[PDB]
Amino acid sequence: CPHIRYAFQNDKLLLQQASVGRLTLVNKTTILLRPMKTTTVDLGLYARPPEGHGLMLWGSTSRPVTSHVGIIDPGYTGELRLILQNQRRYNSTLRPSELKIHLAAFRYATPQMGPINPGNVGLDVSLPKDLALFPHQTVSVTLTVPPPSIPHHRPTIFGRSGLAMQGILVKPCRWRRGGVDVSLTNFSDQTVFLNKYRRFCQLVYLHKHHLTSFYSPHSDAGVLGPRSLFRWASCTFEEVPSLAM
Ligand SMILES: O=c1ccn([C@H]2C[C@H](O)[C@@H](COP(=O)(O)O)O2)c(=O)[nH]1
Numbered sequence: 001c002p003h004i005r006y007a008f009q010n011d012k013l014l015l016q017q018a019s020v021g022r023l024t025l026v027n028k029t030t031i032l033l034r035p036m037k038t039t040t041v042d043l044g045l046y047a048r049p050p051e052g053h054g055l056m057l058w059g060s061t062s063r064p065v066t067s068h069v070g071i072i073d074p075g076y077t078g079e080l081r082l083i084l085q086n087q088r089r090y091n092s093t094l095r096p097s098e099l100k101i102h103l104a105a106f107r108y109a110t111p112q113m114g115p116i117n118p119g120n121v122g123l124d125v126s127l128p129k130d131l132a133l134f135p136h137q138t139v140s141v142t143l144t145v146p147p148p149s150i151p152h153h154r155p156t157i158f159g160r161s162g163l164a165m166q167g168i169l170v171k172p173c174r175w176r177r178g179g180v181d182v183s184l185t186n187f188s189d190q191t192v193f194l195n196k197y198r199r200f201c202q203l204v205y206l207h208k209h210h211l212t213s214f215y216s217p218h219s220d221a222g223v224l225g226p227r228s229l230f231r232w233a234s235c236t237f238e239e240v241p242s243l244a245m
Contacts, residue, residue, distance in 0.1 A: 001235035002050035004105055007243035010044030013101070018237035020218055022104040023047075031094040033065060033086040036135070036189035038165055041082040043101065046243040049074050053105040053233060054121040054204075057082065060100040060222045064088050066187070068164035069172050069223055071204060072103075073120050079245060083164040085187035089136070102220065104232030107207035111148040114197060122158060122202030131194045133168060133186040141200075144179040153205040156224060157182055160202055168192055170201045172224045174211070209233075 006023065008015060016024040025043065033039045049055045054074060059067030059082050068083035082101050086092045114126040125143065133139050147155045157180060159170030167188030173180055182201055186192055194200060212219050212231045223230035 001053065001105060001233045003238035004047055004049055004055070004235050005238050005240040005243060006045065006047040006103075007239065007241050008045050009244050010042075013043065016100070021232050021235045022102055023237050025101040026097050027094055027099040028096055030096065031084075031099060033084060033092045033094070035086050035089050035091060036167075036187070037086070038167055038187075039084040039086070040165070041084065041101070043080045043082060044244070045080040045103065046077065046245060047072070047080065047103060048077065048243065049105050050235060052107055053235070054108050055103055055105050056223060056230065056232065058102050058220075058222050059084065060102065060220070061094060061098055063094055063098050064092055065094060065099075066169060066185070068161065068169055069158055070161065071121050071158050071202065075119050077243070077245075083161060085167060085169060087187070102222070105235045106210045106233055109150045109153045109205040109207070111150060111205070113148070115143065115145065116147055116203060117199065122160075122204045124160075124199040125157070125201050125203050127194055127196055127198045127200045130196050131184070133184060133192045133194065135186055135189050135191060138183050138185045140181050140183045142179055142181050143175065146177060147175060147203055150205050152208050154208050154211055156204050156206050157201050158204055160199070163200065166192065174224060174228050175203065
């Protein structure tokens with residue numbers, strides 16, 4: 001893996017380290033999460049993945065907060081943001097050091113082809129039926145028609161940022177042979193009506209090397225869960241201050 005070029009400037013976050021292909025930031029200040037609303041963290045972070053790679057952005061905390069897992073497209077030169085949701089019906093705070101923010105790369109592949117719909121990592125997946133997502137509840141839907149097989153890669157499902165901003169998170173998961181149950185959780189106070197054919201998540205083909213059952217400083221259960229640990233590419237971070245905007 002060639003360098004991940006990056007820039008970082010934000011006095012409210014600490015760069016903890018950039019090690020074995022993962023950069024980790026921590027919050028220096030208290031972050032307040034209102035209930036029933038999105039909290040976004042403007043990271044002051046910019047990054048460009050080497051050829052053949054995308055970037056994965058995720059948050060980790062033991063507090064009752066759920067973060068969107070962000071798929072970062074290779075041509076994206078804007079600022080990175082972390083999108084957070086409050087699990088509780090009261091204010092939740094992340095005191096300094098309670099939030100870790102991780103960025104790391106991965107190889108991905110793209111099929112040439114609803115239900116599965118310019119350089120983006122993920123292909124949009126459409127809703128097979130209308131769903132009403134009531135406030136503070138989860139709704140699940142099954143995708144059974146298998147996506148194209150790509151040698152040495154594994155299909156996986158992630159959310160998109162647009163729905164995350166409206167309080168709707170997708171739990172990322174592997175799309176195995178036999179089908180996948182996709183769970184959408186509404187962290188808002190508003191019932192959201194998603195209609196048939198609406199894009200609701202994205203299919204991403206990770207190189208098989210990026211899923212492992214082994215725990216180490218090279219993998220993390222925070223992305224797709226504890227069965228399918230995410231093992232990022234072993235790239236080097238290279239600071240390029242000019243990238244900051
Ligand atoms: O958590 C995220 C997810 C995405 N992005 C940026 C990088 C992506 O290329 C772009 C669009 O993301 P989606 O709408 O496809 O999620 O926004 C973020 O800053 N944070």
